[PDB]
Curated annotation (Swiss-Prot):
Belongs to the protein kinase superfamily. Tyr protein kinase family. Insulin receptor subfamily. This is ALK tyrosine kinase receptor. Phosphorylated at tyrosine residues by autocatalysis, which activates kinase activity. In cells not stimulated by a ligand, receptor protein tyrosine phosphatase beta and zeta complex (PTPRB/PTPRZ1) dephosphorylates ALK at the sites in ALK that are undergoing autophosphorylation through autoactivation. N-glycosylated. Changing residue 147 to T: In NBLST3; somatic mutation. Neuronal receptor tyrosine kinase that is essentially and transiently expressed in specific regions of the central and peripheral nervous systems and plays an important role in the genesis and differentiation of the nervous system. Also acts as a key thinness protein involved in the resistance to weight gain: in hypothalamic neurons, controls energy expenditure acting as a negative regulator of white adipose tissue lipolysis and sympathetic tone to fine-tune energy homeostasis. The EGF-like region drives the cytokine specificity for ALKAL2. ATP binds at residues 32, 47, 94-96, 167. The chain holds residues 1093 to 1401 of 1620 of the full protein. Changing residue 172 to L: Observed in neuroblastoma. The gene is ALK. The modification Phosphotyrosine is found at residues 4, 36, 175. Residues 24-283 form the Protein kinase domain.
Length: 292
């Protein structure tokens, strides 16, 4: 079985915690590979590998398990273990009842009925949570390559929610796809032009995630296609502030999108700037838009 290296240690599939299949019960689908709520009782999310998939898909599936299993940080989803000795293969993950961040933002947008569903501080806390996860990845020399709202999860819907990075499929592929599937709208110029990835790649992507968060779940670069975005960004074009976005928050975005990677902040600096935003009453007392 293939090996994987993280921090100072090397690992293989034999190192994955095998959970006996008989101890695992599926409860319900969680919007689908497919994903289920399961019990081991320990409440888990079950990621399945379709049996009709290929040997390569098999290897990618296991590699993702290895990757997540080796992280240890509060803002990265935990891997409970795996069930690889029976078909279909399972990966067992921390159950994140709040679901993915993009869906959460879109479904929890403040309304005339629920105008106080979300406030600016909630959004800043989500941003801080994911930045803390990104800082951990940066300091351990791991490049995610696809930081985006769709790949972040929430522990729960309500106020105590914690956001975590949940999906590592892109980093898995590169570790061992088509052009139209590349997340170009989250990528800096040196990434989509030269295939160069560094931690400053993730900084750029985080800026786009910030826009996703403060837009309350809009697709980046409204009305633009991938190729149009490629030309737009290469020429110096950047997104406008989301509706009602505080200047200090938009400033973090535009720093994340500096053309030269050396001019973009690392995640320690991003975290400091997010923290300052949470301290500023003029920022956190800003009302979010209410869609009618
Ligand atoms: C693989 C899958 O895992 C989970 C999905 C979910 C999930 C998705 N949707 N929901 C809904 C369940 C019903 N209540 C609203 C959320 C829960 C929770 N925890 C997980 N570990 C997943 C998905 Cl489906 C999407 C993005 C991710 F980053 C990840 Cl890691």
């Amino acid at each position: 079985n293939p090996n994987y290296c993280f921090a100072g240690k090397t690992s293989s599939i034999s190192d994955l915690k095998e959970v006996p299949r008989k101890n695992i019960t599926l409860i319900r689908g969680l919007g689908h590979g497919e994903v289920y709520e399961g019990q081991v009782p320990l409440q888990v999310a079950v990621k399945t590998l379709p049996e009709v998939y290929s040997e390569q898909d098999e290897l990618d599936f296991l590699m993702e398990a290895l990757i997540i299993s080796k992280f240890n940080h509060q803002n990265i989803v935990r891997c409970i273990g795996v069930s690889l000795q029976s078909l279909p293969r399972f990966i067992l993950l921390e159950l994140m009842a709040g679901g993915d961040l993009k869906s959460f933002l879109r479904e929890t947008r403040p309304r005339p009925s629920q105008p106080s569903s979300l406030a600016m501080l909630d959004l800043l806390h989500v941003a801080r949570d994911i930045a803390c996860g990104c800082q951990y990845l940066e300091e351990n020399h791991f490049i995610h390559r696809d930081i985006a709202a769709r790949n972040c999860l929430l522990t729960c819907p309500g106020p105590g929610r914690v956001a975590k990075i949940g999906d590592f499929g892109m980093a898995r592929d590169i570790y061992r796809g088509g052009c139209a599937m590349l997340p170009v709208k989250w990528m800096p110029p040196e990434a989509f032009m030269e295939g160069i990835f560094t931690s400053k790649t993730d900084t750029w992507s985080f800026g786009v995630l910030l826009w996703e968060i403060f837009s309350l779940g809009y697709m980046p670069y409204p009305s633009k296609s991938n190729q149009e975005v490629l030309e737009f960004v290469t020429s110096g074009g950047r997104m406008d502030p989301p509706k009602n976005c505080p200047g200090p928050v938009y400033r973090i975005m535009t720093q994340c999108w500096q053309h030269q990677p050396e001019d973009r902040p690392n995640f320690a600096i991003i975290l400091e700037r997010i923290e300052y935003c949470t301290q500023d009453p003029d920022v956190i007392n800003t009302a979010l838009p209410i869609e009618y």
